[PDB]
Amino acid sequence: LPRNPSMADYEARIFTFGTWIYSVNKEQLARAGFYALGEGDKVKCFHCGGGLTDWKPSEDPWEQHAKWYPGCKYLLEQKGQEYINNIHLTH
């Protein structure tokens, strides 16, 4: 079960990125399960609850999500175990 059931749907998540002024694409972030918290470029995953901040220019939300929260179920559901392990086995 997700830590934030209200953000289980992509539409609810992208909504929170109303005025997003950062380089990291908000659509990608939302697809990767993230939703903006309202302060800085801070986002959290609706399922695992993991938060990420200080995003870099060409940084992929999914890679960052797998790199820091390899145990996320949404992550596993969407990308599969092979993907997660490979992210961790090729830093």
Binding site: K42, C48, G49, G50, G51, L52, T53, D54, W55, K56, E59, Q64, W68, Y69, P70, G71, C72, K73, Q81, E82, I84, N85, N86, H88, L89, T90, H91
Partner: protein
């Protein structure tokens, strides 16, 4: 060369120059209480001996502690974390036992003590934090578990750090019909180390293992390593 300047680059690779390299604790659970319903893990003794020999040759002071209850596994880990690693470059924990799932966003999984009581990988890993063990701060803390079945915030700082967990639940035996032949995953890991530790870092070694596990079946292929190392780890070979 390209491989020589990477091994030495103190910015890219952990420096493992001390002799001994560090402690290596191996929890080897073979016999479980009848009541738990967990089967005797025959073949584990040979898995243990392979790893004990492996890390000894990698310069670690290996200590084997067998048949530990959940509580005693924790005590043994707290004990290891409570020691002074000031003169060591790395720490290694190896757990061989039955296991079960335990959800966690960073270090999922759990292992059973001989009593059939679970100990999550998260608790095991966090025993070695920079507050309880500053002595191992900035030093690789490796965990190899065979359990037969942007930046984060709150405060912006990279954590976990210098933690590497290889968690395997692959139940296969070297000899698929003989449960005493030893764990296939352990053998594959030992084999890869014997042939590549001298020239390849931990990540590459486990990638080779994952590659092997892959052509063996795969639904498990869960050695699902949780890599939070900040630099490449090249072991100190004989």
């Amino acid at each position: 060369g390209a491989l020589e300047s990477l091994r030495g680059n103190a910015d890219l690779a952990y420096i493992l120059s001390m002799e001994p390299c560090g402690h290596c604790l191996i929890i080897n659970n073979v016999n479980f209480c009848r009541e738990s319903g967990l089967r005797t893990r025959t073949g584990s003794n040979i898995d243990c001996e392979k790893l004990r020999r492996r890390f000894s040759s990698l310069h670690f002071m290996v200590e084997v502690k067998g048949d530990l209850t959940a509580k005693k596994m924790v005590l043994a880990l707290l004990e290891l974390a409570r020691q002074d690693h000031g003169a060591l470059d790395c720490c290694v924990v190896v757990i061989l036992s039955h296991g079960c799932q335990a959800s966690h966003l960073q270090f999922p999984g759990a292992v059973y003590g001989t009593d059939g009581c679970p100990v999550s990988v998260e608790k095991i890993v966090n025993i070695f934090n920079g507050t309880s063990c500053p002595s191992l701060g900035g030093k690789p803390k490796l965990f190899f578990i065979q359990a037969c079945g942007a930046t984060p915030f709150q405060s912006s700082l990279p954590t976990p750090s210098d933690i590497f967990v290889s968690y395997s639940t692959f139940p296969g035996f070297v000899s698929w019909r003989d449960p005493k032949s030893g764990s296939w995953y352990v053998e594959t890991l030992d084999d890869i180390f014997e042939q590549w530790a001298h020239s390849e870092d931990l990540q590459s070694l486990l990638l080779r293992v994952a590659n092997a596990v892959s052509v063996k079946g795969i639904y498990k292929q869960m050695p699902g390593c949780f890599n939070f190392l900040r630099k490449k780890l090249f072991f100190k070979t004989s």
